[PDB]
């Protein structure tokens, strides 16, 4: 029913992909430890979601931990589009060293089939990042 909110990940997300440590990716959903930790090139990490076409993003957030030192994300770019070849920047977020819950998207009025969370920088220029979970709430249309 249009307008009602959703919090069941599997009813909103068709697929979840990550740039590295693919075997750990499911930790982003339930938020358990040890969390997803990238194993790739500095500033090139990403998480990509495909969203079912009757779901708008009501809330999208990520959980970080200041105790992670140089694994803590510090600069994140969120993009969305109708294909992975059509991603446009939606928001650039500068994370502060003491942040824990990081808002990424809210109250989207446009449908995004693909959403990308790109970790462009980590605290103290760490190479890899740790993200302790994603929070997704959807609105049916």
Numbering used by the authors: 2774 to 2914
Sentences from the paper on this structure:
The E3 ubiquitin ligase HERC2 has been linked to neurological diseases and cancer, however it remains a poorly characterized human protein. The selectivity of ubiquitination relies on E3, which recognizes a specific degradation signal in the substrate and accelerates the transfer of Ub from E2 to a lysine residue of this substrate. Our findings suggest a role of cytosolic HERC2 in the ubiquitin-dependent degradation pathways.
HERC2ZZ is followed by HERC2DOC of unknown structure and function. The core of the domain folds into a β-sandwich with the five strands, β2, β3, β8, β5 and β6 forming one β-sheet that packs against another β-sheet containing the four strands, β1, β9, β4 and β7. The first α-helix links β1 and β2 strands and another α-helix, α2, is located between β2 and β3 strands. Electrostatic surface potential of HERC2DOC reveals a well-defined negatively charged groove that lays parallel to the β9 strand and is ideally positioned for pairing with an additional positively charged β-strand of a ligand. Because histone H3 regions are highly positively charged and are known to adopt the β-strand conformation in several complexes, we tested whether HERC2DOC can bind any of the H3 regions using a pull-down assay. The structure of the DOC domain (originally referred to as the APC10 domain) of the protein APC10 superimposes with the structure of HERC2DOC with an r.m.s.d. of 0.9 Å. The binding affinity of HERC2ZZ to the REEE peptide in the presence of HERC2DOC remained unchanged (Kd of 1 µM). We concluded that although HERC2DOC and HERC2ZZ do not appreciably interact, a conformational rearrangement in the protein may occur when the two domains are linked.
